């Protein structure tokens, strides 16, 4: 277990800084020596020498005192009680490191930017140490000049088509469980690759939406494992989804200096990896697989309505096994918490395994039934549980807060005492996120920890933080997916929460990131497929413009976030509402007359509006502001939108 001790030492080499904040190497030394299980030679040697050899080389390549003391006390309690040393217990340790040291800077009291967290630096050091140790088992400046690493990027092809292969019969469930099952299947692929390479989750740099980057040793065994994994997963994806889904995995061998941004080869290396991935995605198949594709025997009498395939056996109600499993697990994914990759379950997963969502009792039962059964905890920072990895998900449904509302579904959102009973659908995504990752950071501040921090923060905001963002609103998040967000709820709540989401997204990442969204209005009985398609075209039109836009309702209402939040719903809507409720003589008919005047493009209508405003009994300030708005074109469409929104809100 020399490797296990080395990885324990590499992850826990900079705990000395933490205990000092309450040479740091010695402090970490005695602090690790305070616990009997954490007394192995590797851990203490790494903590001492990091200021073994491997930990030192990996480290080279990679507020108030009361808070620090409290964190130290909690760390002592966790190490003494919940954390032990041993195989398959590392995942708990890494979850603990991620949960605790995220807010502590890796390097402090230095003129350099403390933008790298302790967790990020420790994880990068552990990954680099694992790769270096693997190469040395395979068998200082010359070591950096030596090629010691592989950057591996694996991307999923056809995710969007797979999500929207829905026939519309059960579109909501299909979309939600398809997105959840795709991201879970990606996580399972990553875990299988890591277990093949005998590496922990620290070597996985990060995963986005159907994309995963991770570094590996340059060993020939690692290359053979990579080739075997690529072939096996390609065959499995062909068997279970003929050209509907695929994964392409490409690697580039790099020296030590490439990781530390020496010679400015970091960006060039990542561009080379992306180009190799693109080439492999272009070819994407082999002769034998093509011949297998074209050697069908039986045509198939019937086909699944959603999956639209005939070779797979079809259920009585016209649903193949995969499609039926997706529909079945849709409810479980939101009802329960734990995800179990077991020998038997509900949805297929590679290596002849199955994914099923169960409670903690089900997860522990499937653990006891058979080992090599993976468990994923969804949105729980506790690390005492073993064989669990935290998988973030934005599973927020307002219907599930009540059983009868859960039975009703989204049809309960249109149940409104006042206001028009319609359903709002939001399709959002980020503008130029790839540009942010490639060139957003300056070349001086480029590092692997930097990009990992950005991606981790983005995923956390998209999935864990989005649930907090929409709390209290009638929103059912169909899927946060990757960076795009598909959300369905009440029209009022959808629009309000889209605005709040924009404000929170500006607060996060220091306002250097922008996202474009589209909001659509559809009746409750309207098919979900049409809602999705039309809101998608709305968001396409919104992103067609320059940077952030919100294509609310009709394509003629392409607005901005500041314009919609203030120029439309604040300076115009609120005065109209207060005039309507305060006045005892005028009602909705007056607003409809103003709307009819404003929609007309003929100039004389403006004059007519004036006449109306003369006998409207309205306040003079509001009268003059309405006149000024009607004179100007942009303010005219703004007032039109405000009037329409108020009428919708005041209907019934």
């Amino acid at each position: 277990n020399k490797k296990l001790e080395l990885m324990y030492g590499s992850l826990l080499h900079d705990i000395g800084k933490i205990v000092y904040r309450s040479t740091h190497s010695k402090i970490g030394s005695q602090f690790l020596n305070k616990f009997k299980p954490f007394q192995l030679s590797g851990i203490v040697d790494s903590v001492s020498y990091h200021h073994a050899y491997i930990t030192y080389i990996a480290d080279n390549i990679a507020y108030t005192s009361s808070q620090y003391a409290a964190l130290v006390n909690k760390m002592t309690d966790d190490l003494s009680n919940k954390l032990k040393v041993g195989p398959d217990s590392f995942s708990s340790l890494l979850q603990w490191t991620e949960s605790l040291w995220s807010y502590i800077p890796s390097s402090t009291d230095t003129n350099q930017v403390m933008d790298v967290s302790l967790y990020d630096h420790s994880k990068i050091t552990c990954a680099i140490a694992s790769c270096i140790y693997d190469y040395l088992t395979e068998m200082t400046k010359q070591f950096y000049q030596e090629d010691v690493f592989l950057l591996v990027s694996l991307d999923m092809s056809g995710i969007q088509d797979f999500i929207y292969n829905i026939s519309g019969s059960k579109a909501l469930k299909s979309l939600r469980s398809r997105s959840f099952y795709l991201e879970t299947m990606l996580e399972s692929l990553v875990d299988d690759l890591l277990s093949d390479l005998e590496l922990s989750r620290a070597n996985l740099l990060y995963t986005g939406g159907g994309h995963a980057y991770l570094l590996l040793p340059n060993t020939e065994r690692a290359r053979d494992v990579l080739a075997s994994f690529e072939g096996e997963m390609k065959e499995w994806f062909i068997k279970i989804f003929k050209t509907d889904l695929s994964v392409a995995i490409a690697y580039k061998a790099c020296t030590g200096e490439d990781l530390m941004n020496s010679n400015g080869t970091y960006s060039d290396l990542w561009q080379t990896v992306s180009r190799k991935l693109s080439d492999k995605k272009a070819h994407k198949y082999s002769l034998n697989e093509i011949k297998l594709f074209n050697s069908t025997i039986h045509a198939g009498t019937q086909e699944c309505k959603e999956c639209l395939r005939s070779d797979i056996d079809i259920s009585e109600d016209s649903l193949c096994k995969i499609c039926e499993g997706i529909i079945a697990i849709s409810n479980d994914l939101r009802d329960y918490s734990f995800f179990v990759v077991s020998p038997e379950g509900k949805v297929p997963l590679p290596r002849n395994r199955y994914l099923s969502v169960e409670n903690q009792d089900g997860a522990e039962r499937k653990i006891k039934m058979n080992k090599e059964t993976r468990i994923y905890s969804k949105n729980q920072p506790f690390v005492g549980k073993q064989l669990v990895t935290n998988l973030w998900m934005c599973d927020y449904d307002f219907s599930t807060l009540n059983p009868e509302t859960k039975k009703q579904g989204i049809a309960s959102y249109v149940n409104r005492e006042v206001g028009i009973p319609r359903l709002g659908v939001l399709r959002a995504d980020i503008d130029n996120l790839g540009t942010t990752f490639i060139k957003g950071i300056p070349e001086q501040y480029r590092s692997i920890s930097r990009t990992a921090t950005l991606s981790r923060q983005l995923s956390m905001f998209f999935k864990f933080e989005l649930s907090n963002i929409l709390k209290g609103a009638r929103i059912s998040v169909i899927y946060s997916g990757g960076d795009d967000l598909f959300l369905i709820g009440a029209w009022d709540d959808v629009i309000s929460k889209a605005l709040v989401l924009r404000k929170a997204f500006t607060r996060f990442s220091a306002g250097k990131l922008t996202f474009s969204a589209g909001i659509g209005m559809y009746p409750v009985k309207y098919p979900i497929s049409k809602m999705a398609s039309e809101t998608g075209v709305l968001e396409d039109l919104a992103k067609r413009g320059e940077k952030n836009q919100v294509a609310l309702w009709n394509d003629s209402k392409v607005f901005g976030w500041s314009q919609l939040e203030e120029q439309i719903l604040k300076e115009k809507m609120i005065p109209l509402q207060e005039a309507l409720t305060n006045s005892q003589e005028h009602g909705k008919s007056f607003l409809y007359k103003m709307l009819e005047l404003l929609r007309n493009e003929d100039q004389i209508n403006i004059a007519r509006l004036a006449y109306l405003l003369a006998r409207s009994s309205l306040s003079e300030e509001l009268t003059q502001s309405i006149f000024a708005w009607s004179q100007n074109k942009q303010q005219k469409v703004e007032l039109i939108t405000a009037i329409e929104y108020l009428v919708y809100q005041i209907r019934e």
Binding site: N554, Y592, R599, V647
Partner: protein
Amino acid sequence: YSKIRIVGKIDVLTGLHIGGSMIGAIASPVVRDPYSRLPIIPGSSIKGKMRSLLAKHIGDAPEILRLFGSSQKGAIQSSRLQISDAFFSKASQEEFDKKDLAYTETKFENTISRLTAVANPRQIERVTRGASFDFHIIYNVENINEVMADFENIKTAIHLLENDYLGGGGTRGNGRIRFVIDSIDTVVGDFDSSNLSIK
């Protein structure tokens, strides 16, 4: 094989709402050509109305299935009537461009409920009376022996359609039409269709 082309015009006698948004706007806009925005008549509406009328007069019948296609088990028949969409005619475009007349109109309607005697406004777009649509029909002469009979059936359907309505709230006085069969000219094959007339 032969194919007989029937061209003509569909003169609108009452505003036709062939059916197919913002508050205080047209709740049920008619179908339009996506680019030209001119209202059109979907050929599916014509085919459905003619099939319904022919079925009611005849009465699954072999005539209806052989004219308008059948996918039923065993009896697979290719539809003989290909009724293309009827587009706004250029002549009506000019006649409506003159006198600054909108191509369509927005009828305001209501509905007095039987309980509260309250009304419900409804802005139905209807293609304005006097608008002519260039309809187009193709007949597939699968068999030479039953041409005339089918044409008789077609005539019956058309006759019925001129006393019935086209798509919309026809029982409330929408979409009454008149076919003006400009010609019946054979386009494919040597079959002669001079003696056959739709009306």
